[PDB]
Structure 1
Amino acid sequence: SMQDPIADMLTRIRNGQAANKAAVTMPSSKLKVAIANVLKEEGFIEDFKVEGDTKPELELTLKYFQGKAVVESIQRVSRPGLRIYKRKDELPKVMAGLGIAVVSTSKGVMTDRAARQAGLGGEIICYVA
């Protein structure tokens, strides 16, 4: 959005899923693609690309196993006016461990397990189940 560009990413992804869409598109961003990269390895998204050397536009591909979709849970947490910063011993564990939790570390964007395995903390980004 014009105020919360990251929160929009999640919404556009979840809104697409519900509508059983194929691919979601929206303006890119260092953090955005960075986040989009994680869900990739996590198998939450098929692939992802962008267009524009001056006018970048993210391109994500939704995913679904059977009748229902894959990403059946995606919400934010550390939003503006109410940001969240956890330690290496406070990091959340989405769905008892199954779901992932994106968190920006001094090393870069990671997941609840990722950063933990490292032994460092960062500003939580969102919960993906």
Structure 2
Amino acid sequence: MLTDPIADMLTRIRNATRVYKESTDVPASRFKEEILRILAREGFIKGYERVDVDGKPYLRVYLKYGPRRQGPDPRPEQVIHHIRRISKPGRRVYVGVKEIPRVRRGLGIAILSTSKGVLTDREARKLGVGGELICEVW
């Protein structure tokens, strides 16, 4: 019955990406979007677009990967090595600006809804604002 839509999606990506799927869909939500609108605006996914399955608003997420490889098992590396849902519906995780994660040390990104929008660790620190720590990516 969907306890947490968000976590579902991040999990959908993770799941597709392991098979090396070109795309995948997921029920639409403004909030669901602004999240994708960062994996994109960060080169994690080529992008997304509001499709319509059975007149049911979905979001086609186009997955970005790496280049093929030499050696046994030529499967490419991946753009999203680790995607994880931090703040959960069972344990919300709010953070002050002064304590915003340094994901993978510079490399990684942390997304978070704030009374200023769905920023990222940098952008959030750039505005001097904190908020619910949505997830981490790299």
* Structure-2 residue corresponding to 1:91: 100
1:66-77 counterparts in 2 under 5 A?
66=67, 67-77=76-86
Cα deviation for residue 69 of structure 1 reads 1.4
Q: Distance in 1 between matches of 2:47 and 2:86?
A: 25
Structure with greater proportional helix content: 1
Q: Which amino acid aligns with 1:13?
A: I
Gaps of 5+ in 1: none
Answering whether residue 10 of structure 2 is matched by residue 14 of structure 1, we say: no
Gaps of 5+ in 2: 68-75
Q: Deviations over 1:74-129 (max 9, x none)?
A: 00110012110001110111101101000011111010111101101110000001
1:43-58 counterparts in 2 under 5 A?
43-52=43-52, 55-58=56-59
Paired positions, count: 128
Q: Which amino acid aligns with 2:118?
A: V
1:1-129 counterparts in 2 under 5 A?
2-52=2-52, 55-66=56-67, 67-129=76-138
Q: Secondary structure at the match of 1:126?
A: strand
Structure with the greater alpha carbon radius of gyration: 2
Cα deviation for residue 55 of structure 1 reads 2.4
Stretches (4+) displaced over 2 A: none
Q: Which amino acid aligns with 2:50?
A: V
Q: Deviations over 1:11-69 (max 9, x none)?
A: 001001101110011111111111000111111110110124x6211110111122211
The percentage of counterpart residues that share the same residue type is 48
Please tell me the root mean square deviation across aligned C-alpha atoms, in Å.
1.1
Q: Distance in 1 between matches of 2:51 and 2:16?
A: 20
